[PDB]
């Protein structure tokens, strides 16, 4: 397999970037995309060039650190998988493929393909939790949770925080991430006592961080690696409407350190 790559190359935040082309003559069809990037980096270091920088920790599709925009589709052309899971047996000999970071105002670009995703952490910090301190927990089987509710909560809770939903929608909205967290915490009884405040706070924080609105387009669900469905956004909308009917006011925003 002979593969032509068009990699986004940016030195830092202030320095503008551009596309650069690299040709790889020999490619093993069954090695993953990130391993191809590793071989390319090794070749660049051997030649005397600056290696391509990208995020990767687990290479299993669970940690959520890997983040690439390949051929215009987040996490590669195949769906329901992350960038680390994308093996390039799904590409074609002689193909020309372009790789870019996420593009958003809330995800500043730090290097060639590395972005700053701390806005998700700040969204979580503003209410995305259950305020229970250590040692005060009751017995495990005190509160029953139906199997269906627990299953839906687990479906919403399996979000790896990759940020591909933000890079999918044109509006640059974090609605899928916020909705998934709100749905996960709102389907269990332990999340009841502060849910109507929680959603409002979280939504406000997203507006504070620079994300756009949701036009209900639906790119995020088609890109999301964990098949998080649009019912999470409907649940968030129901919760926010109910909170507005109660006169719940958002708290002060979480300012970064």
């Amino acid at each position: 397999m002979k593969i032509t790559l068009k990699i986004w190359r940016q030195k830092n935040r202030n320095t503008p970037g551009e596309f650069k082309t690299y040709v790889m003559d020999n490619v093993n069809p069954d090695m993953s995309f990130l391993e191809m990037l590793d071989v390319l980096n090794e070749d660049l270091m051997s030649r005397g060039e600056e290696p391509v920088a990208f995020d990767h920790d687990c290479r299993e599709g669970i940690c959520g650190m890997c983040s690439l925009m390949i051929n215009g589709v987040a996490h590669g052309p195949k769906n329901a998988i992350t960038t680390c899971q994308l093996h390039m047996r799904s590409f074609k000999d002689g193909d020309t493929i372009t790789v870019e970071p996420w593009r958003a105002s809330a995800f500043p670009i730090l290097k060639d393909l590395v972005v700053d995703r701390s806005a998700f952490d700040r969204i979580i910090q503003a209410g995305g939790y259950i305020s229970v301190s250590t040692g005060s927990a009751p017995d495990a089987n005190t509160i029953p949770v139906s199997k269906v509710a627990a299953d839906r909560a687990m479906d919403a809770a399996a979000c790896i925080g990759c940020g591909a939903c933000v890079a999918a929608c044109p509006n640059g909205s974090a609605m899928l991430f916020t909705a998934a967290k709100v749905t996960h915490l709102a389907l269990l009884p332990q999340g009841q006592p502060e849910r109507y405040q929680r959603v409002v706070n979280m939504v406000a924080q997203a507006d504070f961080e620079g994300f756009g609105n949701c036009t209900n387009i639906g790119e995020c669900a088609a890109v999301c690696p964990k098949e998080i469905s649009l019912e999470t956004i409907a649940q968030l909308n129901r919760d926010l409407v109910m909170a507005a009917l109660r006169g719940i006011e958002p708290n002060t925003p979480i300012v970064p350190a």
């Binding site: 215009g72 593009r103 105002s105 639906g218 968030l236 507005a244 006011e249």
Partner: protein
């Protein structure tokens, strides 16, 4: 603590305001097309409908009271829709200016897998705004795009809306503009009828396909009727 006004503060609250306003506006559009279908019945029935709009419960509700209430509600809804649209569009435009190759291109390559709703919705909204202004100025008042000595204002209790319509869609430019606006409004409804149900949260796995079908049928009906009117007027089917 302010109450239901809290929807003004957040983006989702503006979206909810927009959804309720869209409910009202979709209802008005459907009812208006249904009422305008009467021009095929004849000038007598059309003028009777136009007169009876003002005399809506005339013995009990007075003259033009209900029509003025409906007009006020429609104006309030339209203004709220415009305000929320402009605010949300500016906010979503700010989310892309920092990280983009150019001011006209976000990614060097981006392939969409769920439609082009944003472009269609926003451009159709602007076009619909301009069309509403021109249509009100052109058929309700008859002061623009109309030959002199051809508009008959309501003189007392007699209405000549059939004459105004049959003499309105005669310039090909006007009928082309109307057809363009109606295409964009068809796309607008085709997305928004489902989008407003999703925004209020009245959606799940069971009802998604049903709501999509309802949106499709509503948009198709409105488009067919509202393009049948001026084309028929221009070609001479309605004389």
């Amino acid at each position: 603590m302010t109450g239901v006004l809290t929807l003004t503060r957040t983006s989702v609250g503006k979206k909810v305001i927009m959804a309720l306003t869209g409910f009202v506006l979709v209802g008005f559009v459907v009812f208006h097309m249904y009422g305008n279908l009467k021009m095929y019945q004849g000038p007598e029935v059309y003028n009777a409908y136009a007169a009876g709009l003002r005399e809506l419960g005339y013995p009990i509700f007075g003259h033009e009271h209900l029509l003025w209430i409906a007009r006020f509600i429609l104006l309030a809804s339209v203004f709220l829709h415009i305000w929320a649209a402009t605010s949300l569009t500016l906010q979503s435009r700010r989310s892309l200016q920092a990280s983009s190759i150019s001011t006209v291109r976000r990614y060097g390559q981006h392939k969409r897998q769920s439609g082009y709703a944003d472009y269609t919705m926003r451009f159709g909204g602007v076009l619909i705004f301009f069309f509403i202004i021109y249509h009100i100025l052109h058929l309700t008042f008859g002061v623009v795009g109309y030959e002199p000595g051809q508009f008959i204002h309501p003189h007392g209790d007699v209405y000549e809306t059939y004459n105004n319509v049959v003499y309105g869609f005669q310039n090909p430019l006007i009928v082309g503009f109307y057809l363009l606006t109606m295409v964009f409004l068809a796309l607008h409804l085709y997305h928004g009828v489902w989008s407003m149900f999703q925004t209020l949260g009245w959606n799940n796995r069971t009802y998604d396909r049903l709501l999509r079908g309802l949106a499709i049928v509503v948009a198709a009906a409105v488009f067919i009727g509202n393009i049948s009117f001026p084309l028929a007027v221009y070609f001479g089917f309605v004389a």
